[PDB]
Design a protein around this ligand. Structure first.
Ligand SMILES: [Zn+2]
Ligand SMILES: [Zn+2]
Lengths: 42, 44
């Protein structure tokens, strides 16, 4: 699924942003994750 | 889906419900739990 793959990608990006000290970027990525989950679980 | 996918689906719903209840502290707990489940799901 392209949705599943995007969710997987975002999981990794969240780790990368956290490791860089960019908790602001984590927040945006969590919003991206919500957009995808809302579609995937519909 | 798998048990982890089903659990994740529930957490997605619970986050909306906690926001509606004004419980942003619960949202934080749930987002941490979501990460724990996703981490396990992708480790498999
Ligand atoms: Zn949603
Ligand atoms: Zn993780």
């Amino acid at each position: 699924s392209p949705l599943a793959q995007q969710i997987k990608n975002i999981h990794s990006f969240i780790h990368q942003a956290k490791a860089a000290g960019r908790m602001d970027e984590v927040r945006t990525l969590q919003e991206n994750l919500e957009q995808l989950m809302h579609e995937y679980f519909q």
